[PDB]
Subunit: 54 residues, 3 copies
């Protein structure tokens, strides 16, 4: 699965880790995170994230 | 997937659109919406909805 | 699916029933419950639960 980065604050969503404190378990692809989730650091929505392409 | 309507207020849940502001992504069948979700307009529970049959 | 028990208060999570008032539908395996869910009786996290083995 791909990593996504918040373009406002640089936080990286890593699908291996998830975001368990906000209900997003390990192994969750970014597209499957509920659409009301926000960046843990900056508080902005999913629409300010983009794929980390290698 | 089928559309469901709130029988209290007439809101239509359309699975193609979801209800993304409340965490229900596009493509979510009504049976899979978490059971604590409520109608966005009237605030009533899933048990007041019924299938829109054609 | 296996039942899990809260080791703090003895609550039993039964996957057939779920915990629908807190958004966990019937048929949800414990591993798939969002990781910010807490025991309905004692308020403690998933890390204080263990499998009920028969
Ligand atoms: Fe951010
Ligand atoms: Fe309604
Ligand atoms: Fe408990």
């Amino acid at each position: 699965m791909k990593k996504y980065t918040c373009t406002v604050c640089g936080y990286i969503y890593n699908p291996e880790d998830g975001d368990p404190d906000n209900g997003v378990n390990p192994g969750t692809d970014f597209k499957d995170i509920p659409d009301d989730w926000v960046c843990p650091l900056s508080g902005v929505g999913k629409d300010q994230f983009e794929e980390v392409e290698e």
